[PDB]
Design a protein around this ligand. Structure first.
Ligand SMILES: *[C@@H]1O[C@H](CO)[C@@H](O[C@@H]2O[C@H](C(=O)O)[C@@H](O)[C@H](O)[C@H]2O)[C@H](O)[C@H]1O
Ligand SMILES: *[C@@H]1O[C@H](CO)[C@@H](O[C@@H]2O[C@H](C(=O)O)[C@@H](O)[C@H](O)[C@H]2O)[C@H](O)[C@H]1O
Ligand SMILES: *[C@@H]1O[C@H](CO)[C@@H](O[C@@H]2O[C@H](C(=O)O)[C@@H](O)[C@H](O)[C@H]2O)[C@H](O)[C@H]1O
Ligand SMILES: *[C@@H]1O[C@H](CO)[C@@H](O[C@@H]2O[C@H](C(=O)O)[C@@H](O)[C@H](O)[C@H]2O)[C@H](O)[C@H]1O
Ligand SMILES: *[C@@H]1O[C@H](CO)[C@@H](O[C@@H]2O[C@H](C(=O)O)[C@@H](O)[C@H](O)[C@H]2O)[C@H](O)[C@H]1O
Lengths: 178, 140, 37, 37, 48, 48
């Protein structure tokens, strides 16, 4: 009856090897999608970055009430949503992080379009969107000589730092470049 | 094991920036903005610990609410003020420099290591500016 | 008996290696085109 | 039986890779602070 | 494989994620995490 | 045998950090912060 016993155990070890086979394949499938995701976001973190073209602001009396920035995609950048981005404003007085808003604000920022389709998303390389920040609202209208340290942080994590330096003299200037 | 070990490597915190409030002439608050890593999952800031190697002390800060020798998390962008769910969420980690040890003077250096629940350590060497004159808020 | 067990697990390991091989290569393919551009 | 041995060695390789991944990231973090300073 | 998104739950939005395990008759499971692109501006068809 | 052998491999300790006190000019305290490894059970630190 030793032929009976081997048959039963043979069935069991087939199942056990199938159980272990599932574990390696299923865990590899888990790590396949996890690793595939990791490469794409990590590349997006390094490549999808905002580049500031030029900075200027409207000035009233002698203290720049509004601060405006012109942004664009960096080299090899996918769609860049300016709505899921946060500019951190480190000014002479206040030092907070601004968030996206619509229709002009207080401690928020607005993005009006200059060239392109969307007015909040940079889709192509020739799109220019104007980041709008109210200086007198976030803190105070910067006098001649104030030095704000702006840093635009994209959703994925790419950070662009711009030191907005107000000219030391604001005389006879309807609107000066920061 | 496969799920936890991948969690140990993947679910990691990246510190976007670090700034500090200034009273009189000393950094009294240490504020840190945090975000997920590439491929991170939901990161809970309540099950995280921060190691504060200060100039005068060395303790491991734990989570609290509304500090002293603990740390609080006020939200910046997103819904949850203690959990980072999406890649566009920013939460501000709050630390009281004049409560975990002594008020950070101009030039003090503190090492902060934010350890997630799964064990992903992120180290940020905070350096108070050498000169603090005429600076209402500094960038650590 | 033990011969049956090692055969099935052998099939498992090559597929897992095939899965792992695809992950690195396809990720390199994404990085190649992104890097090239 | 062969499956039993594979599962145990599978855990070790996952754990060992986690150890190796930890060294790379933590050393990069130390060098990042050194380079930034 | 044709799967109507608007009927199973709802037409996905930019940034969504679905975990799909296509299991055969014999129990072989294949897991795919479909990830809608974070931005759907000016793209007739994407690649999850 | 299966359970203890798995515990030998899976139940492990990970040292998160290693700080220490300083007296005069000598380290009089060695402190270790420890945590479970991936997929570990309860770890009594008295039988270690
Ligand atoms: C930043 O962009 C703002 C976008 O609205 C500009 O706002 C306009 O400024 C004009 C003037 O220069 O003061 C006003 O006539 C418009 O009504 C106002 O919207 C702002 O000038 C610029 O710095
Ligand atoms: C770090 O975060 C703190 C969170 O409470 C900020 O605290 C506020 O600071 C304000 C001011 O800048 O001093 C006070 O008006 C608030 O009452 C206080 O809670 C802190 O400013 C920041 O650096
Ligand atoms: C300008 O020079 C001052 C000379 O006294 C410095 O003052 C000292 O700074 C120390 C520290 O570096 O913050 C404090 O511990 C001393 O109490 C303080 O007098 C000052 O730091 C420097 O910016
Ligand atoms: C650019 O940022 C926009 C910020 O509002 C995104 O807008 C939201 O998109 C959601 C979805 O992803 O389609 C909608 O459910 C929301 O109602 C809409 O405001 C936009 O998707 C993004 O591309
Ligand atoms: C390791 O942990 C020890 C736990 O007791 C710490 O011990 C304290 O150290 C203090 C000082 O830093 O020397 C003493 O004032 C306490 O009495 C002593 O218990 C130790 O500092 C730490 O390195």
């Amino acid at each position: 009856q030793v032929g009976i016993g081997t048959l039963i155990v043979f069935i069991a070890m087939v199942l056990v090897a199938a159980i272990a086979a599932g574990v390696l394949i299923n865990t590899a499938g888990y790590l396949q999608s996890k690793g595939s995701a990791t490469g794409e976001e990590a590349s997006a973190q390094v490549s999808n970055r905002i580049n500031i073209v030029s900075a200027y602001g409207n000035v009233x009396x002698x203290x720049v009430d509004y601060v405006n920035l012109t942004v664009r995609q960096a080299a090899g950048a996918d769609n860049i949503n300016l709505x899921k981005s946060t500019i951190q404003w480190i000014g002479p007085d206040x030092a907070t992080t601004l968030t996206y808003x619509x229709x002009x604000x207080x401690e928020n920022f607005t993005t009006x379009s200059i060239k392109g389709x969307x007015x909040x998303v940079l889709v192509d390389q020739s799109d220019r969107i104007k980041v709008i920040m109210y200086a007198x609202x976030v803190x105070x209208x910067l006098x001649x000589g104030x030095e704000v340290q702006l840093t635009v942080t994209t959703q994925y994590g790419s950070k662009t730092t711009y030191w907005a330096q107000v000219p030391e003299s604001l005389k006879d200037k309807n609107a000066v470049x920061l």
